[PDB]
C-alpha cells in the first residue's frame, strides 16, 4: 500500500484531489488581474523580475493576455502547438523487453489510444510553451480493476508559486512563504524549457513581452492617427464683440460642413481649415512588420527544417514529462509489485521525417541486388 | 534568442553512440555498449546536453552531479544547472573555474561533482571565449535603436495643438481655452475670437528609414 | 428511441457556473443556474486555446482586429 | 429504466425538452442586444471580462455581430 | 491579414492541421454525446463504457495515384506490401 514514487520515497496515495481539500477553497478561485492594460516597459520589467524571484502569478496573467490579445502571436502559438498534436505516438516497451514488459507496454498503448482524456492532456500540456509550465490535476478513478485517471483538469498557472529555495520545484500556493507542495501522483506537470534556467525564466513570455508591447502600442497609435487623419479642423474666427447669439449660429454652421458644403460668411469672419494630423502610414507599418517578424522568429524560428527541429525538441521534452508522470503512476498504482524504475515502458513519438516513395522505390531494388537491406528499415517509411 | 535557440537545437538533433576505444577488446566493447545503452536509457542525459549548450553565449556551462545508487552502479540521478554567476575564474592561471566562496583564490570545484563544458568559440581564457563579448555591441545598438524608434512613433503624425490666448485674458478664460484645445479630435470644429490663434506645430519630423536600417544591420 | 430534430439554441442563454467555471448551465435567473438536462443537450466545446469555456472562443482574439478594421473602414 | 450516463450517475431520462418546461418560457425568448454598435475598446474589454467571469451573453452577441458584420471575417 | 491568420493560420499544411484538430475535437464531442446516448437508450443492458463505437473522420491525406502506381509494383517485387494499405488510397 505504501507506493514509492520515481525518486524512491514511500508515501500514501490519496484519491482526493489536492485542490478539493476544503482548505484551499479560497485560494483556488482567483479572478484574473489582466495586467496587460496600459503596460509600461518599466512595469513589464517589474513583473518579469517578480516572476524571476518566484511569484509567477503576474507573469502567467501577462502571458494569457498576450495569447488572447496579439492576433499574430496567437496564430503563431497555435501553429506551433498543433504540430505536436499531429504526431502519431506509441508506447514502445523498454529496450530488450521480455514477454510481460511488452504485454504491459501494449496494454498501456491500447488504453491510452482508447482514452478520451489523453488528447486533452497533450493539448493542455502545450500551454507550457508560452507561460513556462503546464500543470494539470489527475482525478483518479476506478475503471474495472485498474486505477486510471478519468479527467485531467487544467488548473490556472497563476495558482503555483516556485519555492523560494531551489527555485525549481513548483509548489501550489497556500498563502505561505514556502508554499504547499504538490500532492504526489496527482499533478501532471510539464515544464517546457525553451531556454536554460529556472522554472519562471524558461517561458517564451520573457522574450515575447517586448515585441508584443511594441507592436500593440504601434497599432493603437496608428489607429488613433487614422481616427484624425484626412479631415482638417474647421475653425471659424468670429470678430470680437459679436453677440452671444451669433456665436451659436456660427458654431452650428461650422459644424454643419459636410459633402459639397457651401455657405456665406461676412467680410469680418474667417473659415480657415487647419490640418489636425500630418504624416503617413510608413513608420507604423514598418514597426508592426518588424515586431511581427520578431514574434514569428521567437515562436517558430523563421518567418522548414527549423520548425521540424523545434517540433522534435519540444515533443521530446513532452515525452519525457509524460514518461515521468503518466506511465509510471499508472504502472505503480495498477500493479502491486515494486515497479522496476530502470526498465519501464516509455512513450515515443513518430517524429521521423517522411520518406519520398518514388526515390525509395526506384533506388532500393537497385541497391537490393547485392546488398541485404532489411524489409523493416524500409517498412518504417509509410508501411 | 531565436538565433541562439536555432544553433542550440542543432546539437540536440544529432544522434550519438558510445563508440569503444580503437581496437577494442571484448571487455572494453562490452563496457562501451553498456554505457551506450544506459545513457540512451537515462532521462538526465538530454537535460545535460541541453544545458551544456548554455556555454555558447555565456562562455561556460557548469552543472552539478547528484550521485546516486542505481542497483550496483554509482551513477548520476540528476544534473542541476547552477547559475554561471556563482563561478569566478582563479586570478592565477585564469583558466580554472572556481566556485566563489568570498575568497581571493576562491573555492575549487569538488572532483567528480561538476560537469563543466567550456565552449571556446574564440581562443583565449575562460571569460573571453563567450559570444557575449562579440554580441554585446550589436545588441546595444539594435535595442537602443528600437526604443528610440518606438518613442518616435509615440509622438509622430500628431501635431502639437497650441493656443495663443491674448494677454490679459481672465483666469477663467484660460481654463476653457485649454479644455477646448485638448478637446480636438475627429472632425473637430469650433469658434475662436479674432485675437486668439490655434496654430498646429509638428512635434516629430522624420521617417522610419534610419531606424530600420540600423535594426537590419544589427540583426 | 433516436433524435428526430436538433434545435440550435442561442448561445447567450447559457451562463457558465461561477464554480468550476467549465460546466455550461442553462440560465434560469439564478446564481448557480439551471444545469443541463442529461441526454438532452448536444454540447460541443471547441477549445482553440487552452482555458475555460468562455475563454477558448476565437472572438477573444478577433475582437481587436475586427474593431480596428471596421473603424478604419 | 434508471439509465446511467457516461460518468456512471443513475438518473431518469425524460422525453420532454428542457426549454419546453413551462418554467423557462420567459428566459428562452431574448431579443438580441446587438452590442457591436459603437464599440469602444474599453467597452469591448469590459464585455470580455464579464464573459471571463461567467456571463457569456454579451460575448455571444458580440461574436454574432462580428460574424454577420465583418465580411472578410 | 491578422483575421485570416487567426482563422485559418496563414493568408496549405497549416489549414490541414487546423481541420484535423478541430475535426478530432468534434469527433470526441460526438462520441461523448451522440453515440453513447443512442446506445444506452436503445439497448437495455449496461453499455460497456470502455468499449463503445466511436466516430472516425477520414482525415488522411489523399495519395497521388501516379507515384503510387509506378512505385508500388517496383517495391512489391521483394516486399510483401498489403493490398489493404494500398486500398486506403482512393479504393
Numbering used by the authors:
A (entry chain B): 2 to 304, 322 to 401
B (entry chain A): 75 to 293
C (entry chain C): 148 to 220
D (entry chain C): 2 to 74
E (entry chain C): 294 to 304, 322 to 401
Provide text from the study:
The release of the TMP and DNA in contracted Mu results in a contracted tail and an empty head.
It has the capacity to infect a range of intestinal bacteria and has extensive applications in genetic engineering research.
